[PDB]
């Protein structure tokens, strides 16, 4: 898939044997019987990141690995100096910014979110921004319906797909 590029941090460690790393290659059916069960976005050491990092303006963009000064790096985040500077994808105008990723041992992490109470790609308590790895980061949203939506953040028109319960 699009994730197997050398600018993706790939520090994965399925210590609990969930199967989540296999879900990144082959699309897998999640066990729905397990489903029911304001932070700022900065810089994440790549060593705690597995798979692609997405931020949302609310439009989704991928953040690749760099060194701590913003120079792109191509070693799968395996270098101790590799980072993900999330805030370099924040637009200069706008109060809408959040990101989401998987940490090393298979947990979905999040920061930022809508202005405000909703973090990362979640727009409302029932809707999140759709993006190519939503089902891997949020497998319990697999039956959410896709809606074309239009949002205005500080004047600019955003046209994106929202997945909604």
């Amino acid at each position, epitope marked *: 898939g699009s994730w*197997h590029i*050398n600018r993706t941090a*790939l*520090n*994965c*460690n*399925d*210590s*609990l*044997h*969930t*199967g*989540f*790393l*296999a*879900a990144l*290659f*082959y699309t*897998h*059916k*999640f*066990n729905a019987s*397990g489903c029911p069960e304001p932070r700022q976005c900065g810089t994440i050491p790549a060593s705690q990141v*597995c798979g692609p990092v997405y931020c949302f303006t609310p439009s989704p963009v991928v953040v690749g690995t760099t060194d701590r000064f913003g120079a792109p790096t191509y070693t*799968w985040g*395996e270098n101790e100096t590799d980072v993900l500077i999330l805030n370099n994808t924040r637009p200069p105008q706008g109060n809408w910014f959040g990101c989401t990723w998987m940490n090393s041992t298979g947990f979905t992490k999040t920061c930022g979110g809508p202005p405000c109470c909703g973090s990362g790609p979640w727009l409302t308590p029932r809707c999140l921004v759709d993006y190519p790895y939503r089902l891997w980061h949020y497998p319990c949203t697999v039956n959410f319906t896709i809606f074309k939506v239009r949002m205005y953040v500080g004047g600019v028109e955003h046209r994106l797909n929202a997945a909604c319960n």
Partner: antibody, heavy 127, light 108 residues
Framework: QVQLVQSGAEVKKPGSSVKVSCTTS????????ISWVRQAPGQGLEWVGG????????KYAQKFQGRVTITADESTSTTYMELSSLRPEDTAVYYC????????????????????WGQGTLVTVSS | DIVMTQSPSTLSASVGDRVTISCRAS??????LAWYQQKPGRAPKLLIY???SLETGVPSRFSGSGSGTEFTLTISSLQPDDFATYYC?????????FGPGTKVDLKR
């Protein structure tokens, strides 16, 4: 509380075939790649084959080329090992275990046979 | 094909001893080596992967060392639960291959 449950013991004449199953329950995902390892009476462990967690296609020790076919029923979380042209030395306890992608290096990821294993299936091949 | 061998084939030691057992690969296998423990009549158990990484839940008295073609497993202080047969195993995308195993029994 994932569990792997194998089908029951089998008795076969030489030259026949046997099809053993492994069903997963209690999992985070409905299906897992499964591999098979056997142990003859008094002997060591011998990998036979299973489904790859990357390609979701069978992979075998090529010692078994042409008489092992591995298949999977996605709707029943079951994987099957069919071993043909059976010979007395195929008499063994056959275990299954998830072939699970565990860690990555340099963009390449590696899978291990991880806990829990199935309980074992005795297959006896004899006239 | 890559062939795994182990030494010694059997070892008698006491509770509390330091034990080191060895595994050799016919060709270079980098760090793609794992150790499994097996008690008679039961399924094996993964202890170590990537030559030296402990599997989740495995006591710290276990350790592994080596790279390339020479590997060891070490038990810093043998305990009653440790008497068992230990198999090394090379893994890659295409196959797994087990070594012949080393049986450690309790000396009395």
């Amino acid at each position: 509380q994932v569990q792997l449950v194998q089908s029951g013991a089998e008795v076969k004449k030489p030259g026949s075939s046997v099809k053993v199953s492994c069903t997963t329950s209690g999992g985070t995902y409905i299906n897992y790649a499964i591999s098979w390892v056997r142990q003859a009476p008094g002997q060591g462990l011998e990998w036979v084959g299973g489904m790859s967690p990357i390609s979701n296609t069978p992979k075998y020790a090529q010692k078994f080329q042409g008489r092992v076919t591995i298949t999977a029923d996605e709707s029943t979380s079951t994987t099957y090992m069919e071993l043909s042209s059976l010979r007395p030395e195929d008499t063994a306890v056959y275990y299954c275990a998830r072939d699970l992608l565990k860690y990555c290096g340099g963009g390449n990821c590696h899978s291990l046979l991880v806990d829990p294993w199935g309980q074992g299936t005795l297959v006896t091949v004899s006239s | 094909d890559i062939v795994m061998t182990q030494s010694p084939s059997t070892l008698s030691a006491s509770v509390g001893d330091r034990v080191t057992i060895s595994c050799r690969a016919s060709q270079s296998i980098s760090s793609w080596l794992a150790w499994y423990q097996q008690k008679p009549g039961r399924a094996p158990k993964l202890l170590i992967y990537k030559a030296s990484s402990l599997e989740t839940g495995v006591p710290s008295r276990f350790s592994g060392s080596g790279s390339g073609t020479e590997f060891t497993l070490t038990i810093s202080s043998l305990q009653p639960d440790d008497f068992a047969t230990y198999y090394c195993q090379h893994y890659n995308t295409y196959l797994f291959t087990f070594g012949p195993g080393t049986k450690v029994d309790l000396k009395r």
